[PDB]
């Protein structure tokens, strides 16, 4: 069994000197290789990709001059006046405000915003909380001014909720403010970190997608203008703007590159329903005790929230990824074999000559695929007991019968026609009768009736001379000298005495007939001799005791 | 060499008409195809997936009525009173508070919380910072009330740290508050963006996992109740709640779909140790100068922080992903071949007939695999110098010797038994002696002693008649006419003169014996002639000058 | 066609008893298997990986004692005095501050920071906004102190912008503060959630990478010291520090593990340009009305922003991932076949014996690959009309001509030399003349001139005796008895009358010569008979009417 370990199996192959097939093979191989390499390079499937972790630090610069009114009030706003302490992934710049000073808890008329003007105390509801007004209704319609009256609410008073944002925006100058963004990223798996500002960078730059695509200083109005948004209009009610920072980073030494790409995107819907809080604002309150009364000053601050969104991946060569990709793509290199074998097996079909070629004679030279097919494939048949082969001297083909004989004579049974194999020319280049019978020599079978129909076969389908009348039958089958010579060839020291030699000669005659007619040993093994030939052989080599056994299943 | 380019190699194959094998093959092919397709469709391995980038904007609605006590104090809380300006990925709603007004830097008794009541100045430590009390101890135990005394600390005074949160929570009405969540997402690789609110959506809706699973307006109490949490109890000390927004988005036109799925999850541990800050609170201070004294008002605000967590992927068809998947799965289509070849090579074994079949005769019909194996495999042996083949007329098999001869005669040397090949019946269907010897005809070798044992072989293992006594030996081996005919067949214009013709006839006789006995040319090449036959041949075709060279290694 | 369904094709293979090839095959198989398994286990390519979603809750503990100056002012700072309400992914600890109390809108001298000292009103610019000073210049150079004068600005006054941060930092004690971090993560795809604090954990612990690598309580100074950063110096101007929490989590039951790894990283550049806002600070304003004047108190707060960065993946077994990996790696198991077949086809080359072996005789035993190659490959040639084979009795090889004959005689045409196939020894082990001619027997062709050169071939290249003079030619080719015997073998009941039998005998003689000389039937089919032999055959079997057709293309 140890030799069973030291075995190598290699496939048998046939080789063709064909220009067409070799050319097609190499073309397909090159195509597969080119696509595989292109995909590998384009998608960098040799790399392991890791997402980044980011930190953002922002700084806003700018002073706004605000002139508002009775009297002309001039003032300015600095960063502490329009920005919040947060300086990370988001920052807020106030662009407009409404302020209510000295609020007190008490009853006051609800502000007459859209559809808040009541006509009778029936319209008002006692105890009902109005989230819009931010107070509790007392169910009384009371005057708000000379020509309007509204529901009385308990709230911080005076209540200006629902008041329209001032137009134009008070902090319009914010269009001209600048923000510096510092972005630190890291790929912890690859142990790589970098930042968006490097030594030698200019500090007086201002971002431009063309001239200065790497300056991290942005004018807000320019941010809006780059994407077709009007800062002046958004400043009235506010909005949300995104600054996207994309890092497509290659961390391989021979191709190292990691720099940010900046882009902008509005994040609030422009056509938001008035009931879904259009824009962006928040209310900030300060609380103080004055005159023994606890009071509140509220500012409703409209502005733009800038969301800084940082995303990306870092790639570095990984051998396991490349190995997996190559394995995934290796099987595509059998395309040439699949296609050319398909061509060979398709043009080897007979129908491709009888029908296709007459219509199109350009494909006539493609008949050589029959030769390739016969040199490539060896068809064989499952050797099961009902398998039988018969040959008729009148006909040139062989007939295969692969069904049980339900009493019907094998002569009458139909069968699948198959070609007669060609005998090797090298080896050849040497020196009252039964109704089913018509050769005048067959005899009734001598087996049990259950299996008598097997031996009820003749040498031909039509009346004529028996095959055994030929001298070849006696030369090959009944020539005792030839059979003894064959047996001696197999058993040099054979003893020619007894009935055993007679049986051996009878079997050799059966084999000789079967090999002469069916040629192939696979067919010869399952062949069936005609009754005439069988009984002639048996008469030439009689069996003293017992009746003849007949054909036996080799398996 | 150019013709070497234009070559196509195709594998030689044998074909079997078998119902069982074809059925198994197609079943396995269909199984592999079905699993591959199912996996591709289920996991959408034809798609490239990209993670989303998100922006969240929240708005809380609701007014709380608070009645607290000496006197009955009625007041209300609006959004500016219980929410912070931040409206992004997280928002905070105050549900309870403790307020300390008019704090001053001075010495005060430490608040008598759990285990903070001292009995003597020894318990207190001078200069020690207590993070719980948030002051510096002076090492003196001083009275706090009539019946308790605590360590004196320098801190903002009066100090109420450690005071229990009021129960029930003052802002319980917050259960009935609502929040509107607006979520904007983008897949920048796929250049796709959408939002969680679309035109035509109802505004008076309230979220429900069944009735309104797409309304982005949520009642906080409902959020808690959906996951078995009690808002009333959490409101006392606070907590953290997660609102998860999942985007499983398909961006293919024929299957386009991108909508959010909402879900809730508590993020703070319910059974947190009292020493690990259970709940959620923060302390907010306002500073003011009154009476020339700089004072502080501190509010300890308990509440629920809502964390909005947005995650998901967007898939779109990619040809390279599909190609990689198909390549990864192509090799699974050789399963049918592997399994059926395994069956053929396993049932071709001899042991599978001698032992297995008697126990189970259902497997008797599976002996046909021997035929398939012999039609599929051609075993060959490495042709190395020690390779030899011998045949004995008494025995029916061949004996292979593959070891060096250490003086021992080849007759005595043991060998591996191998079958005698079958001669093509088509070609056959034609017209004082040494101790190791027992045929009475062998002679001692005439080589040098170092290699004499090679030629010390007989024609049989047991006493009997020599093979050469048969007429076949003279007909085939010693028939000068036959050998001349063979030589002329190979060399039509051969000259029959000199000793060269004698040598050629001797070699042809050796070849004829080797082909007759061993049949196969692979075995014939490495065969060894018996001494009797060899010396008989040499006598029939004597060599005038020199001793005979003997067997030569073909390689 | 139904039988076409029930077919199984298996490859024909040859088997070699070789120790070297089997050993190499098993070594390569084991190598491929070992690498595949190692990669699968190391990279856990059987797992589907999901990114986590995180929530962070922080709590800072500590009290700072600050003694600052005229008079000695002693005070303390608690969490509400140096922390902001936010307690999520980032938190801020104030380490230094500059405070400006009682600011008013009015004109004031610009603070004399680096290069802000003007000498004349020309240096100042009217109406220019200075983001550094945060005011509007009036274009007047006015005194700031006794020995310096600066540009007058309208701003919040007094303006201290540009003033140096105090050194040493006032809140140095913050080195000794602690922060507790609570981190909740979830893998929603795998439906797994955990947290960084579990029951039974010690509460008095403090983080250490060696002793306490799992305590989520961190001293800030220790955070800095672990990565070689000086808290004392960073406290003056501030900075940003990252606390990274990595979750490498395996969610398989047999290998379950999910715990955090903590690490630190400075996120602000240490060598930042003074014009790019080095450090970290923000300005916070409180607004109040005093004496009827609206005033502002501004604090410029320097400190450390701590960014808590949480990242990681969770893996769980997926069958589809494993199936894809196995399919991707299956094709690597053909390496043994590729390599050994390459060896066989490379050492089967002739040049590898004539040249390589003499230089290196260690490779002499590798000549056995010629036997393997001839037992493995069957070369065949495309059967196209110009294909011809010729043989010359003087020469021992065959000559293939694969080009059109442009009138030149086939005798003169050159051709590709090919070996003569070996005849099966088993079958063999039996009983005025044209200028191009030199055998004295050839005759001019009798075809049309367009195709006469095909038949203008002789039996030899050099003068000598004709092949047909041999008795073998008459025995094999002209033996009428042998040809009739062959025809009867193929057609047992053949009728020997008419000219049809003569034509059959002529064709059989052509076939016999072609098989005798070219041996292979593939070459015999396209062989060309010499004129001498052809005309001798035709004379022996004359054609009564019509001229002889000649060679015909089989396809
Ligand atoms: Cl969004 C935001 C961010 C940061 C701070 C604030 N707050 N909070 N309280 N006040 C402000 N800003 C200042 C201010 C706002 C409106 C009206 C008057 C006013 O005072 C003056 C007086 C003179 C010149 C300039 N401003 C806000 Cl609302
Ligand atoms: Cl968490 C948070 C978010 C947003 C704001 C605050 N702040 N900061 N300072 N005050 C508040 N809210 C108001 C307030 C809280 C407690 C007690 C009294 C009180 O005032 C009144 C008086 C009458 C009616 C209602 N409230 C906080 Cl603590
Ligand atoms: Cl960053 C930040 C976070 C949180 C709060 C604040 N604010 N905002 N306003 N004041 C503070 N802190 C308090 C304070 C800061 C500087 C000087 C004096 C001072 O008051 C006293 C008085 C006695 C003892 C201690 N402090 C800031 Cl600046
Ligand atoms: N192929 C084939 N073999 C046959 C046929 N008849 C007999 N045999 C073989 O010949 C043997 C039986 O010969 P037979 O003389 O009838 O048996 P006997 O009773 O021992 O004399 C069996 O092994 C059969 O395989 C036949 O028609 N075709
Ligand atoms: N297979 C085989 N070949 C043999 C044997 N003896 C001789 N030969 C072959 O015959 C040739 C030598 O014949 P021999 O008459 O001894 O050589 P001589 O000295 O030239 O006459 C060699 O090429 C051998 O391959 C044998 O026993 N077996
Ligand atoms: N291979 C080969 N075949 C030949 C040659 N000459 C004739 N044939 C074959 O012999 C047949 C023609 O024989 P021929 O006597 O000339 O034809 P006829 O006119 O019917 O008598 C054709 O089918 C040819 O394939 C030859 O030189 N080589
Ligand atoms: C922005 O700056 C330009 C140039 O100084 C000025 O013309 C423009 O009016 C400014 N915009 C606003 C809104 O003040
Ligand atoms: C931008 O908005 C402002 C305010 O409504 C308006 O005056 C101005 O014309 C707008 N500009 C454009 C280009 O729409
Ligand atoms: C919530 O609203 C319902 C219906 O108005 C009311 O019955 C309930 O008391 C409210 N909850 C609280 C805590 O006020
Ligand atoms: C919820 O908590 C409150 C406060 O402790 C309690 O009164 C109420 O019974 C609780 N409800 C449930 C269902 O546990
Ligand atoms: C930190 O604490 C240690 C031990 O109490 C003390 O020696 C050191 O001075 C403290 N650091 C500062 C900056 O106060
Ligand atoms: C840390 O910084 C402080 C402030 O500059 C300095 O006094 C101290 O020597 C520094 N320590 C080290 C180790 O550099
Ligand atoms: Na594969
Ligand atoms: Zn008959
Ligand atoms: Zn008959
Ligand atoms: Zn002997
Ligand atoms: Zn003998
Ligand atoms: Zn000639
Ligand atoms: Zn000739």
Tab-separated table of N, CA and C in Angstrom, chain A residues 132-204:
chain	number	residue	atom	x	y	z
A	132	UNK	N	-46.896	75.703	20.069
A	132	UNK	CA	-46.478	76.837	19.254
A	132	UNK	C	-46.336	78.097	20.094
A	133	UNK	N	-47.360	78.420	20.881
A	133	UNK	CA	-47.313	79.589	21.746
A	133	UNK	C	-46.462	79.368	22.984
A	134	UNK	N	-46.307	78.119	23.419
A	134	UNK	CA	-45.487	77.786	24.578
A	134	UNK	C	-46.112	78.329	25.859
A	135	UNK	N	-47.414	78.109	25.996
A	135	UNK	CA	-48.144	78.538	27.171
A	135	UNK	C	-49.421	77.749	27.329
A	136	UNK	N	-50.080	77.990	28.457
A	136	UNK	CA	-51.312	77.307	28.829
A	136	UNK	C	-52.468	78.274	28.633
A	137	UNK	N	-53.418	77.890	27.788
A	137	UNK	CA	-54.574	78.731	27.523
A	137	UNK	C	-55.524	78.754	28.712
A	138	UNK	N	-56.093	79.927	28.972
A	138	UNK	CA	-57.114	80.100	29.993
A	138	UNK	C	-58.525	80.093	29.423
A	139	UNK	N	-58.673	79.927	28.112
A	139	UNK	CA	-59.985	79.906	27.504
A	139	UNK	C	-60.648	81.252	27.371
A	140	UNK	N	-59.879	82.335	27.351
A	140	UNK	CA	-60.412	83.681	27.221
A	140	UNK	C	-59.756	84.381	26.043
A	141	UNK	N	-60.577	84.974	25.184
A	141	UNK	CA	-60.105	85.773	24.063
A	141	UNK	C	-59.950	87.214	24.532
A	142	UNK	N	-58.716	87.706	24.541
A	142	UNK	CA	-58.419	89.028	25.084
A	142	UNK	C	-57.715	89.869	24.030
A	143	UNK	N	-57.798	91.193	24.112
A	143	UNK	CA	-57.137	92.033	23.111
A	143	UNK	C	-55.625	91.886	23.155
A	144	UNK	N	-55.016	91.922	21.974
A	144	UNK	CA	-53.570	92.012	21.825
A	144	UNK	C	-53.115	93.396	21.404
A	145	UNK	N	-53.888	94.059	20.550
A	145	UNK	CA	-53.630	95.430	20.144
A	145	UNK	C	-54.979	96.094	19.894
A	146	UNK	N	-54.953	97.258	19.247
A	146	UNK	CA	-56.190	97.985	18.996
A	146	UNK	C	-57.135	97.202	18.094
A	147	UNK	N	-56.599	96.462	17.123
A	147	UNK	CA	-57.410	95.849	16.077
A	147	UNK	C	-57.313	94.328	16.039
A	148	UNK	N	-56.724	93.695	17.050
A	148	UNK	CA	-56.644	92.242	17.098
A	148	UNK	C	-56.753	91.772	18.539
A	149	UNK	N	-57.289	90.566	18.706
A	149	UNK	CA	-57.428	89.944	20.012
A	149	UNK	C	-57.081	88.468	19.893
A	150	UNK	N	-56.436	87.931	20.926
A	150	UNK	CA	-55.914	86.574	20.895
A	150	UNK	C	-56.176	85.892	22.228
A	151	UNK	N	-55.988	84.577	22.234
A	151	UNK	CA	-56.224	83.782	23.429
A	151	UNK	C	-55.220	84.122	24.524
A	152	UNK	N	-55.715	84.203	25.756
A	152	UNK	CA	-54.869	84.464	26.909
A	152	UNK	C	-54.161	83.191	27.345
A	153	UNK	N	-52.855	83.299	27.578
A	153	UNK	CA	-52.044	82.163	27.985
A	153	UNK	C	-51.212	82.547	29.197
A	154	UNK	N	-50.944	81.559	30.042
A	154	UNK	CA	-49.954	81.691	31.099
A	154	UNK	C	-48.621	81.210	30.549
A	155	UNK	N	-47.634	82.087	30.545
A	155	UNK	CA	-46.367	81.799	29.895
A	155	UNK	C	-45.349	82.818	30.378
A	156	UNK	N	-44.131	82.702	29.867
A	156	UNK	CA	-43.191	83.806	29.920
A	156	UNK	C	-43.711	84.937	29.049
A	157	UNK	N	-43.901	86.102	29.649
A	157	UNK	CA	-44.560	87.207	28.981
A	157	UNK	C	-43.699	88.457	29.055
A	158	UNK	N	-43.676	89.271	27.988
A	158	UNK	CA	-44.451	89.133	26.750
A	158	UNK	C	-43.980	88.013	25.835
A	159	UNK	N	-44.937	87.379	25.170
A	159	UNK	CA	-44.682	86.245	24.297
A	159	UNK	C	-44.659	86.709	22.849
A	160	UNK	N	-43.529	86.493	22.175
A	160	UNK	CA	-43.364	86.863	20.777
A	160	UNK	C	-43.206	85.647	19.873
A	161	UNK	N	-43.553	84.460	20.359
A	161	UNK	CA	-43.424	83.260	19.547
A	161	UNK	C	-44.358	83.324	18.347
A	162	UNK	N	-43.828	82.949	17.185
A	162	UNK	CA	-44.516	83.110	15.930
A	162	UNK	C	-44.177	84.379	15.189
A	163	UNK	N	-43.480	85.309	15.833
A	163	UNK	CA	-43.036	86.518	15.167
A	163	UNK	C	-42.085	86.183	14.028
A	164	UNK	N	-42.243	86.895	12.918
A	164	UNK	CA	-41.428	86.641	11.742
A	164	UNK	C	-39.986	87.062	11.979
A	165	UNK	N	-39.064	86.260	11.465
A	165	UNK	CA	-37.661	86.621	11.503
A	165	UNK	C	-37.440	87.925	10.743
A	166	UNK	N	-36.616	88.833	11.261
A	166	UNK	CA	-36.395	90.100	10.559
A	166	UNK	C	-35.807	89.889	9.173
A	167	UNK	N	-36.254	90.722	8.238
A	167	UNK	CA	-35.794	90.689	6.865
A	167	UNK	C	-35.485	92.119	6.442
A	168	UNK	N	-34.255	92.417	6.003
A	168	UNK	CA	-33.108	91.520	5.842
A	168	UNK	C	-32.439	91.107	7.147
A	169	UNK	N	-31.694	90.008	7.079
A	169	UNK	CA	-31.009	89.483	8.247
A	169	UNK	C	-30.047	90.509	8.825
A	170	UNK	N	-30.014	90.582	10.154
A	170	UNK	CA	-29.210	91.591	10.823
A	170	UNK	C	-27.722	91.311	10.671
A	171	UNK	N	-27.321	90.049	10.777
A	171	UNK	CA	-25.926	89.664	10.595
A	171	UNK	C	-25.714	89.114	9.187
A	172	UNK	N	-25.847	90.015	8.218
A	172	UNK	CA	-25.543	89.679	6.834
A	172	UNK	C	-24.046	89.642	6.580
A	173	UNK	N	-23.285	90.478	7.290
A	173	UNK	CA	-21.837	90.511	7.158
A	173	UNK	C	-21.192	89.145	7.340
A	174	UNK	N	-21.907	88.183	7.924
A	174	UNK	CA	-21.363	86.849	8.129
A	174	UNK	C	-21.018	86.147	6.829
A	175	UNK	N	-21.529	86.632	5.698
A	175	UNK	CA	-21.097	86.109	4.410
A	175	UNK	C	-19.589	86.207	4.258
A	176	UNK	N	-18.986	87.217	4.870
A	176	UNK	CA	-17.576	87.511	4.719
A	176	UNK	C	-16.710	86.910	5.818
A	177	UNK	N	-17.302	86.221	6.789
A	177	UNK	CA	-16.521	85.516	7.791
A	177	UNK	C	-15.758	84.357	7.164
A	178	UNK	N	-14.676	83.974	7.830
A	178	UNK	CA	-13.856	82.842	7.439
A	178	UNK	C	-13.807	81.823	8.566
A	179	UNK	N	-13.612	80.565	8.193
A	179	UNK	CA	-13.397	79.485	9.143
A	179	UNK	C	-12.148	78.718	8.733
A	180	UNK	N	-11.286	78.446	9.706
A	180	UNK	CA	-10.153	77.552	9.544
A	180	UNK	C	-10.514	76.191	10.120
A	181	UNK	N	-10.374	75.150	9.307
A	181	UNK	CA	-10.672	73.783	9.708
A	181	UNK	C	-9.370	73.005	9.790
A	182	UNK	N	-9.125	72.400	10.945
A	182	UNK	CA	-8.015	71.482	11.148
A	182	UNK	C	-8.578	70.083	11.325
A	183	UNK	N	-8.102	69.150	10.509
A	183	UNK	CA	-8.606	67.786	10.491
A	183	UNK	C	-7.447	66.821	10.685
A	184	UNK	N	-7.507	66.058	11.769
A	184	UNK	CA	-6.554	65.005	12.078
A	184	UNK	C	-7.227	63.659	11.856
A	185	UNK	N	-6.588	62.798	11.071
A	185	UNK	CA	-7.095	61.459	10.807
A	185	UNK	C	-6.044	60.431	11.199
A	186	UNK	N	-6.490	59.186	11.317
A	186	UNK	CA	-5.639	58.066	11.673
A	186	UNK	C	-6.223	56.789	11.096
A	187	UNK	N	-5.342	55.923	10.611
A	187	UNK	CA	-5.693	54.543	10.299
A	187	UNK	C	-5.006	53.646	11.313
A	188	UNK	N	-5.666	53.301	12.421
A	188	UNK	CA	-4.960	52.586	13.492
A	188	UNK	C	-4.481	51.203	13.098
A	189	UNK	N	-5.197	50.514	12.213
A	189	UNK	CA	-4.718	49.232	11.729
A	189	UNK	C	-3.407	49.340	10.978
A	190	UNK	N	-3.298	50.323	10.094
A	190	UNK	CA	-2.085	50.572	9.335
A	190	UNK	C	-1.076	51.425	10.087
A	191	UNK	N	-1.418	51.894	11.281
A	191	UNK	CA	-0.559	52.759	12.081
A	191	UNK	C	-0.056	53.936	11.248
A	192	UNK	N	-1.013	54.679	10.698
A	192	UNK	CA	-0.735	55.870	9.917
A	192	UNK	C	-1.639	57.002	10.374
A	193	UNK	N	-1.042	58.175	10.551
A	193	UNK	CA	-1.793	59.369	10.895
A	193	UNK	C	-1.216	60.550	10.135
A	194	UNK	N	-2.095	61.463	9.741
A	194	UNK	CA	-1.700	62.686	9.065
A	194	UNK	C	-2.713	63.771	9.402
A	195	UNK	N	-2.481	64.957	8.853
A	195	UNK	CA	-3.333	66.103	9.102
A	195	UNK	C	-3.409	66.949	7.841
A	196	UNK	N	-4.429	67.800	7.793
A	196	UNK	CA	-4.761	68.561	6.598
A	196	UNK	C	-3.924	69.818	6.418
A	197	UNK	N	-3.078	70.164	7.378
A	197	UNK	CA	-2.178	71.302	7.272
A	197	UNK	C	-0.766	70.801	7.507
A	198	UNK	N	0.124	71.100	6.576
A	198	UNK	CA	1.499	70.640	6.604
A	198	UNK	C	2.436	71.834	6.578
A	199	UNK	N	3.672	71.662	7.038
A	199	UNK	CA	4.610	72.788	7.060
A	199	UNK	C	4.855	73.343	5.667
A	200	UNK	N	5.038	74.660	5.602
A	200	UNK	CA	5.253	75.349	4.352
A	200	UNK	C	3.995	75.818	3.662
A	201	UNK	N	2.825	75.492	4.198
A	201	UNK	CA	1.577	75.930	3.598
A	201	UNK	C	1.386	77.426	3.796
A	202	UNK	N	0.776	78.070	2.807
A	202	UNK	CA	0.515	79.497	2.898
A	202	UNK	C	-0.646	79.762	3.846
A	203	UNK	N	-0.526	80.835	4.625
A	203	UNK	CA	-1.535	81.177	5.620
A	203	UNK	C	-2.490	82.256	5.129
A	204	UNK	N	-2.101	83.040	4.132
A	204	UNK	CA	-2.952	84.077	3.573
A	204	UNK	C	-3.839	83.551	2.458
